[PDB]
């Protein structure tokens, strides 16, 4: 799945993960740590929408 950061337009792509921030590819948004935030704008998970 892909999730958009409603603040900045960043797309969290579960296939890509966010490795620079400790998230390996294929990590589901729901599996992201609670304290993970948008690597661009710092928005909390609550501000993401599943596409
Ligand atoms: Fe963002």
Swiss-Prot record:
The protein's name: Rubredoxin
Listed GO MF terms: electron transfer activity; iron ion binding
Binding site for Fe cation: 5, 8, 38, 41
Family to which the UniProt record says this protein belongs: Belongs to the rubredoxin family.
Species of provenance: Pyrococcus furiosus (strain ATCC 43587 / DSM 3638 / JCM 8422 / Vc1)
Temperature dependence: Extremely thermostable, being unaffected after incubation for 24 hours at 95 degrees Celsius.
InterPro entries: Rubredoxin (IPR024922), Rubredoxin-like_dom (IPR024934), Rubredoxin_dom (IPR024935), Rubredoxin_ET (IPR050526), Rubredoxin_Fe_BS (IPR018527)
Cofactor names: Fe(3+)
Domain Rubredoxin-like: 1-51
Keywords: Electron transport, Iron, Metal-binding, Transport
Record carries keyword Transport: yes
GO BP annotations, alphabetical order: alkane catabolic process
Cofactor note: Binds 1 Fe(3+) ion per subunit.
Function: Rubredoxin is a small nonheme, iron protein lacking acid-labile sulfide. Its single Fe, chelated to 4 Cys, functions as an electron acceptor and may also stabilize the conformation of the molecule.
């Amino acid at each position: 799945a892909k999730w958009v950061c409603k603040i900045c337009g960043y797309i969290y792509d579960e296939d890509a993960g966010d490795p620079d921030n400790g998230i390996s590819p294929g990590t589901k948004f729901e599996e992201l740590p609670d304290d993970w935030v948008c690597p661009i704008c710092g928005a909390p998970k609550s501000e993401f929408e599943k596409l």
